Symmetry: D2
Subunit: 371 residues, 4 copies
Amino acid sequence: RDISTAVVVTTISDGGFLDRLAPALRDAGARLIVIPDRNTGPALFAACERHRRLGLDVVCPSVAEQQDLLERLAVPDLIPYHSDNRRNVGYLMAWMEGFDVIVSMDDDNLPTTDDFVERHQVVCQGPRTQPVTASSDGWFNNCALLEVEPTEVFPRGFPFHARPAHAQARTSVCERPADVRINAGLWLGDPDVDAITRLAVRPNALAHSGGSVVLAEGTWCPVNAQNTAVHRDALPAYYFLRMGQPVDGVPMERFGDIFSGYFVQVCAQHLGHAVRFGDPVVEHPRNEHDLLDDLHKEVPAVRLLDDILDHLRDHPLEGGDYLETYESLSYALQEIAERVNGRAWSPDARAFLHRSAHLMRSWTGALRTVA
Amino acid sequence: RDISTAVVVTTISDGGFLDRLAPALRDAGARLIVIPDRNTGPALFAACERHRRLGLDVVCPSVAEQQDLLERLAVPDLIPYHSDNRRNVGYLMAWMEGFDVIVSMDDDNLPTTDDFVERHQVVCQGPRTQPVTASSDGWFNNCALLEVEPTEVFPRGFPFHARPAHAQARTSVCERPADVRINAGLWLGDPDVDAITRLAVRPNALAHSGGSVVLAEGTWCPVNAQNTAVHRDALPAYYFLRMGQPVDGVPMERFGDIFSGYFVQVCAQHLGHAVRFGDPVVEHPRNEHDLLDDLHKEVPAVRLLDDILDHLRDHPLEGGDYLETYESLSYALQEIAERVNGRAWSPDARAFLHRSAHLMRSWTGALRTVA
Amino acid sequence: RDISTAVVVTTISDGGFLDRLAPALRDAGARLIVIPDRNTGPALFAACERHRRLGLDVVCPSVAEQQDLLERLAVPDLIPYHSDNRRNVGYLMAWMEGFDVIVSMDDDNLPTTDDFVERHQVVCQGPRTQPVTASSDGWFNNCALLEVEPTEVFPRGFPFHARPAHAQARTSVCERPADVRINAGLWLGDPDVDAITRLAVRPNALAHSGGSVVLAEGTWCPVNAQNTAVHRDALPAYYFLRMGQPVDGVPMERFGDIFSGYFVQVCAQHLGHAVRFGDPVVEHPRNEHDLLDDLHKEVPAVRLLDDILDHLRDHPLEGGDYLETYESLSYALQEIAERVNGRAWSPDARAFLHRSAHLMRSWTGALRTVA
Amino acid sequence: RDISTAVVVTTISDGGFLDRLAPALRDAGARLIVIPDRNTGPALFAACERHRRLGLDVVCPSVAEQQDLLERLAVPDLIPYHSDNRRNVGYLMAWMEGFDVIVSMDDDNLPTTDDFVERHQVVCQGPRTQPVTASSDGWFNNCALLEVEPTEVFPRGFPFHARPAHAQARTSVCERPADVRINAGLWLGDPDVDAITRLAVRPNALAHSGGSVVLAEGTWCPVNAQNTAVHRDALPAYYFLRMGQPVDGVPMERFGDIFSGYFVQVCAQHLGHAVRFGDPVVEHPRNEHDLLDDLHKEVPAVRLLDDILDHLRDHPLEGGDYLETYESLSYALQEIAERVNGRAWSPDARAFLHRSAHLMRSWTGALRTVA
Ligand SMILES: C[C@H](O)[C@H]1O[C@@H](OP(=O)(O)OP(=O)(O)OC[C@H]2O[C@@H](n3cnc4c(O)nc(N)nc43)[C@H](O)[C@@H]2O)[C@@H](O)[C@@H]1O
Ligand SMILES: C[C@H](O)[C@H]1O[C@@H](OP(=O)(O)OP(=O)(O)OC[C@H]2O[C@@H](n3cnc4c(O)nc(N)nc43)[C@H](O)[C@@H]2O)[C@@H](O)[C@@H]1O
Ligand SMILES: C[C@H](O)[C@H]1O[C@@H](OP(=O)(O)OP(=O)(O)OC[C@H]2O[C@@H](n3cnc4c(O)nc(N)nc43)[C@H](O)[C@@H]2O)[C@@H](O)[C@@H]1O
Ligand SMILES: C[C@H](O)[C@H]1O[C@@H](OP(=O)(O)OP(=O)(O)OC[C@H]2O[C@@H](n3cnc4c(O)nc(N)nc43)[C@H](O)[C@@H]2O)[C@@H](O)[C@@H]1O
Ligand SMILES: [Mn+2]
Ligand SMILES: [Mn+2]
Ligand SMILES: [Mn+2]
Ligand SMILES: [Mn+2]
């Protein structure tokens, strides 16, 4: 096979996460692209070079190197600073260097097994008749594959209007051709849930008991960027959306990967591809957060997500590859921004979709400049 | 004994709730003060007169009669229209007419037993040595007295910072002198939880299993206005706070009774009185709500509640009765508004406490004008 | 020549303005397209038919007729209600019916001479070597053509950063080929100034003493929609921009024709056309306004206009006709929204340009559907 | 006589203004209380010590010395940092040290005559029968005492609703008993006008031609804090109001001295005192400002000022001295905050008056703690 893999992690820490992330990466020969920011301490570069001597192929381009690359591609204002949106630099760098698998992670997700990179290489097996998982309501709850206490939880970015009626949905498995291009790995410890769920029950993922599934055409599930492998063909559709836009005077945040996880998923199924959920599982000792502040950031995005996901099912896309499909998706978001109705859809909330669509085309324009 | 009781309910519905609320009220001789609003149809007045023929002492003063009463008391702008804040008119009316017990309810809380009013008369038994419930953390979860599925929940208004450590709290019962003046009855069906909790687990209260408790000095718990009896002495401290103040440009709502429940509870303990939780239990088939809109309304108040409750334990109050104690409480809130620190304490968030304090004195000034 | 002219006026009044607007329109045979709204009284239709008997060709399509037309062109959500933006319906109707001249007016601008329509027909003379007016600073003050007391004033939409240094600018006249396609007529009484000027000196236009000018390439001046004739070729670029977008949490208003006046002007000079200022002059007994409310509406737009106009001089446009040039302008506004910097350029302020650009393409798409 | 005078100036500059401010201050023996801030460089302290060697009684207490003084008076959170509100420290310091005259100035107002302090000592002559200036509309335009080009202007803080009808007002002078306690000196160069006026005509004060006047009972005029002498008895009523309160989500600024100028003027007339306008005249080479940013800061306060000034004529005050009158004024503002009606009076706009009133009593509570 001879598959190449690059791990993308943006961080502002000192680099102590390398002591638990490097072993699983250097044993597989994968590259770790660390994306620092302006407010990143100089201890990260010393930690990257400390693990560079141990055999880990890790790079840490300074903010000057990142800006010189983005300026050559006519996108100097696309990716802002003091934000985790800079992981798009790692997405771009890994895509230019010809890596087969781009693994998006955070500085607090730690692989639990030695075959972490090997399990993420499932996005390179190509098409094959395989068992696919379908749901009668068109949604799949990936947290059902985990043992979560005290009660059952839904993942972050899961539509709320479909949660009460999801328990009585019919889940079936059929032998169908599928082409896995996105593999969202599960997480133990603190699972990826929204601030509403974490403030209510404080979930704790005990074990992985559900195995792995491949969702069929029409069944969706939110995909995050903390333990997700994306094939290089689907990478153009995996642009981490820019946050900070006010909805009803409240700037949204924490949903950059919620849109990207859904955008690359809608684009994949249009091109005959599928999304996988399950292994490899990582430990998630989540960074210390103000949970009420996470709620303050997530509310502006939650009030709009359910309407966005519903209109995406009514808008058939066009395109032959992920570049054409993603740009067709951006124009579809602009038509949705004017057809959708509701109390939360103020003029600035509709404008959020229009500016995001322009930033999506600015992202694809930079990739076409490289190729 | 010969105890009098008046039930206060404000509503914009057609009055169909009277069919299930009247039987327990007319059999006890209690008065039902229905407070309509400008957005209330003429079906409520026809429903009040229909049950008045059957023997229910129900009154429904028109908005013209309400405004004439408030204008004669030099408070024409205290209580706004198109808001459930108009229940303060019922609090005022029941207090002017000399009722011993004022029961605050909503148009969807329906009693389950014939002795609903009799159980609410516990706020007129006077002081007596009785078992009181104390907690090491100073908080009591009244929802623990209920059988809630699928998991344990906290009531609306419970501080979030004290929820994780509450499982390790020590609950003790001792024979201490206490005087019950507020009786917060429990609710079956849809329990009184915040939008964060209802959006995450959709709680369902199955039965009342914990009995009744009387909190000791230093143990607090939120008290709503949907099934709560208040002695006429503690009625001046039960002013339903006016909502609509913006916090970071977001107007707060749904927490008018959260502050009143805590304010009358802080004033009661300063005067040697206590709060009771438990019976009578009512059925709560809650009206249809947009839960994402309930969340958008409650988040501004949730960001500030934990800090307000913490600083209220630092301010010992003054006063001999509830009128003087509540006014002393308003001045203490204005000192807290400038001492408190935090990200959510913008200039408009601090100004919310100053304007609320003025409305609290404008309220007590109206009661003093009556007496 | 045999030139056709249609006057477009949107109003919510009773139609009393027809008693002073009809004589100058029926004597020239021009058509008056009145655009009512949902909040327009039924007295307007009775006034349109009252003047229809006197010979005035006046039409007043109901909101049902307007929505049926906009729905056939796949633009049902483009033009909102309860807004003067509905004048775009008259722009569209006059453009479909093949009128040579489209005159945009308001219900308070009254022609002072009998040859009002004849003077507005100057946008049909075609190219000819004529004296053109150029300025060293690239700006022209059309109010200098009027006698204004107590002091000199600038028109609404004039950039503030160029006002102090405009007095020492060199104004020259040269014999140059020009093709007049937009003719902005002057106004007596209350001149078209921003709320800042009207609150400061309360201008009063006494007489028209400067005559008429035709601005050369590179010299700009704001063009309003209250007394402006536009040739049918330039009509696609005269889309009245949609207002109501919050900038720093403040919705902008009163600048819909400021952008359209500048957009059709930038598009005209790219295609070798020019803008004329001067006759015909109209009386402007302005409707009663809250001047502090006008300031509250205009401030969000004023804070951004100077930066927008500067970047438009740095962005060369493309296109062979007004449809291609206007759409190229919309994409230029999206590039400006990301390159511009400043304190007033918040994420929602930049999003204002992105949503406006989409509405500009939705406007051109509806015109291409007709043709 | 033997009158003492202390000049209060807060600044973040390097101290170069002392070269033109010291000569008139050191020749009169007056004290200069310079109030630095956290964003003040070390060049100011070196400039204060440089002029202290030349005989200027100038003091510059560090932010640590200021905070220790405010903490000992139980007001550590009253005066914020990074704001010109810190001049209240100078007001407090000059009042504690027993100075008869407190002159409030800015770091860009420079005296033009040698008797600058001597002319400001008019607030210590006591009551005497003197010619007083009265107006039929109750307003006086102090800018009419100046020679302003290109047109007549109104001072910053003048109500806009009274500006048109002010030209028909009757100005009379009568010999009436008056007691001058506030002396608002005039300014040449850049006059103290609002951003609306400066953005429209760019006024330039050429000379002082109107002399000096003493307004009668019922005639008001805004009084700034850049060239104003205040007797030590009226100093408690001269609290510089704290800015930053949002009105419709827009924080107000630049009007801290507008309220203080009116508040000390309303309190003075209740106690039988008057306000004087005219000499001494200073040069005002105003610091560089973004006028569009000055407008964005002043609009929120302008929308409310006319209504506040109107209701202040409906509330007669109580109190024997300025401490009691200013506190009575704070309670009257809270009654106005609920009586006033208008589009601009959102819940946060009314709450601005309630929080400001609490800060006014927190101010006077600090003065009472000293005395
Ligand atoms: C932001 C959202 O919250 C997202 O967090 C995700 O997981 P999360 O909620 O668990 O947060 P967490 O894993 O702790 O950090 C997430 C990673 O962003 C990095 N980071 C933080 N501040 C940064 C800054 O200024 N610059 C740069 N360049 N990077 C920064 C940190 O180093 C972490 O590696 C999703 O939920 C959601 O899309
Ligand atoms: C609103 C908050 O949310 C409060 O609700 C409580 O319970 P709740 O969350 O279950 O809502 P609910 O019981 O349905 O209505 C509560 C009652 O207010 C009445 N009402 C509704 N709109 C009204 C209007 O315009 N005018 C007047 N005069 N009254 C109105 C309804 O008729 C109900 O009787 C607490 O949570 C919280 O303090
Ligand atoms: C709005 C800005 O203010 C614009 O006014 C212009 O002139 P202006 O400032 O002098 O205002 P004015 O001439 O009085 O009215 C302007 C005309 O809009 C009509 N109108 C008003 N409310 C309406 C509504 O809800 N629906 C519909 N369909 N039409 C409405 C009125 O009937 C007038 O005919 C420019 O300044 C600026 O672009
Ligand atoms: C601000 C308003 O606008 C006020 O200006 C007045 O006059 P003005 O409009 O002409 O401004 P200006 O005279 O330049 O500065 C006024 C003085 O505040 C000082 N200053 C500036 N930033 C400061 C900061 O962070 N901390 C501290 N401690 N001080 C600061 C400067 O050094 C000047 O001495 C009134 O209009 C209005 O009440
Ligand atoms: Mn994490
Ligand atoms: Mn309810
Ligand atoms: Mn007009
Ligand atoms: Mn100044």
